[PDB]
Amino acid sequence: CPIERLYGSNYFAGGITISDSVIPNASIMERTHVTIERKSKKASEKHLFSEEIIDAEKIEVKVIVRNEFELWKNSLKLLREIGYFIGGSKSRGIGYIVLDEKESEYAVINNFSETPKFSELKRYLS
């Protein structure tokens, strides 16, 4: 299965290493919510849902893949146009990322005697 060969399994080696995306920015705002009684349009005095939200514009994540799979290229291509959601309450307009081909960059390493070179992601993906 290509998916297992890429992401690993209970006994499989793996193949992909993903770093986190810690952001020095800590701009955190609060977006409260209320439930409306369907029988009568008013606030249901049972709870006051309150949800945090981390506003951001560019999420930088470093990803290393040890399997030059056309599956990976196709996944990145799908993220280029359609784009998927990340994080909770994605059904409520919270979290929707789209990969760009301008800021993001890649690098292919085949020789271990040369310094890796980064170039625009468009050349790799387009």
Added chain:
RNA sequence: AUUGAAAGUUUUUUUUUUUUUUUUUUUUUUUUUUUUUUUUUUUUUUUU
């Protein structure tokens, strides 16, 4: 040249779903555009 040694605590798992800051609330109630001022004065229906 330790009795003596050589093994990554590693793989694998999205903190996710349910929820409209909503209903009610007429920028109105009152206040006379009035108030003092003469369309007045001067002029022969008239001569060789």
